[PDB]
Amino acid sequence: FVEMVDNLRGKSGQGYYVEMTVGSPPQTLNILVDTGSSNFAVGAAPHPFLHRYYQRQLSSTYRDLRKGVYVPYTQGKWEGELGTDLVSIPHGPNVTVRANIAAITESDKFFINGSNWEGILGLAYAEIARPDDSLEPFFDSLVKQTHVPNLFSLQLCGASEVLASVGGSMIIGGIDHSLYTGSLWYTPIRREWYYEVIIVRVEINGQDLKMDCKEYNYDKSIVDSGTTNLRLPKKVFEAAVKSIKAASSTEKFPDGFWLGEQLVCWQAGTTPWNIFPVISLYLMGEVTNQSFRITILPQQYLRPVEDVATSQDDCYKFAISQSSTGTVMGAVIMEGFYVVFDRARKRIGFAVSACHVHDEFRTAAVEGPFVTLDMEDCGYNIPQTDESRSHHHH
Ligand SMILES: O=C(O[C@H]1CCSc2ccc(Br)cc21)[C@H]1C[C@]2(CN1)C(=O)Nc1ccccc12
Ligand SMILES: [Zn+2]
Numbered sequence: 001f002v003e004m005v006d007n008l009r010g011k012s013g014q015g016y017y018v019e020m021t022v023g024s025p026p027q028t029l030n031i032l033v034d035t036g037s038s039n040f041a042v043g044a045a046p047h048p049f050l051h052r053y054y055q056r057q058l059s060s061t062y063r064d065l066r067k068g069v070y071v072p073y074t075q076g077k078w079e080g081e082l083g084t085d086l087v088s089i090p091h092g093p094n095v096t097v098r099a100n101i102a103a104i105t106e107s108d109k110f111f112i113n114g115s116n117w118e119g120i121l122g123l124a125y126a127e128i129a130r131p132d133d134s135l136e137p138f139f140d141s142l143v144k145q146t147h148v149p150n151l152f153s154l155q156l157c158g159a160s161e162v163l164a165s166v167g168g169s170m171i172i173g174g175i176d177h178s179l180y181t182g183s184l185w186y187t188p189i190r191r192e193w194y195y196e197v198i199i200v201r202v203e204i205n206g207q208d209l210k211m212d213c214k215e216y217n218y219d220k221s222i223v224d225s226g227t228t229n230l231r232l233p234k235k236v237f238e239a240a241v242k243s244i245k246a247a248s249s250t251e252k253f254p255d256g257f258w259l260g261e262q263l264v265c266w267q268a269g270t271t272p273w274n275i276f277p278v279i280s281l282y283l284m285g286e287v288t289n290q291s292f293r294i295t296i297l298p299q300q301y302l303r304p305v306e307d308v309a310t311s312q313d314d315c316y317k318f319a320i321s322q323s324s325t326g327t328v329m330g331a332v333i334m335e336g337f338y339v340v341f342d343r344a345r346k347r348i349g350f351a352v353s354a355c356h357v358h359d360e361f362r363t364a365a366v367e368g369p370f371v372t373l374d375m376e377d378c379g380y381n382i383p384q385t386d387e388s389r390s391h392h393h394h
């Protein structure tokens, strides 16, 4: 796995991407690593924000599936044409896979100026593949066509005219022990669609938010490398911000800061980290009534952004924000942690990342077990629509 270490790059807040080739001869593209979706789709026509794109007609190994695909997210949408081609990851396993590729022909609010990526690698399960769950996702094909074990793991690492470069590692087919310290702890995948998990408790500097735990997973809780923020359901967000405000209250920031839409600054080197609390999410353990906590620092959730104007200051954006589609454990959370996507055993592992950003007094932590007698059910059950209900799955 030494050859897959540091195989991710990107810009702070605009996605981690891995180099991939599609086609014969191979066409190199930079592809967003995204565990919140299940499609492999690449830019396939010119776009203001794209340096380059997939040219189907130039690949002798392309096959057109003669079928269209459309995916709107809450933010971002793309469509294109389905097909298959030969795909490899140069800084990945030494294999070539024939995979489904969606060749994006239109899009809105999908590509990001300056991000340097030209498509997306959805690494979540077939159930949220578009246009339906019969479109085999990339990782499924990789595992079916090769010897690669059904597991990958992500080490995302944190960090004046451009945003900060970031770096990471996607270890395809296992677990590199140099990327974490201490214990690896697993939380069960509730269901194989998103990487859906259950949060059973939240503390801010050790104070329990004391909400009904279903609130934390309303309407789900997912791990998503392709989301920058820790995003929280309305009610949890509001309680969380009220608590972080209270701890930090020696500093009186603008509304726009807490809305994640404005920077706040201190003289270089003088940021009063100590006034911002740590946040602990307790995740369901593998054993009934057990849980473990992951503890992130303000270093993770206060995101560095250099000011052109006050480039002499350390400035930060608030990278916790509100959600209407459940808790999203985004790059904020993930940057604390080496995260193991153990599809084979239907679980997700967390250990303290060997590259997480911390200080002299606090570290990001993964700690357990913690026990609960008569642990209620903290899962939410999403209302089933007639659309969803009507689909057959043969
Ligand atoms: O979480 C994700 O998609 C979810 C969002 C909830 S709506 C929905 C509906 C269907 C499917 Br399939 C997934 C999702 C992916 C896509 C992502 C970030 N990760 C995003 O949301 N916009 C965006 C924009 C650019 C890149 C990545 C992303
Ligand atoms: Zn049928």
Ligand SMILES: [Zn+2]
Residues within 6 Å of the ligand: 133, 392, 393, 394
């Ligand atoms: Zn099905």
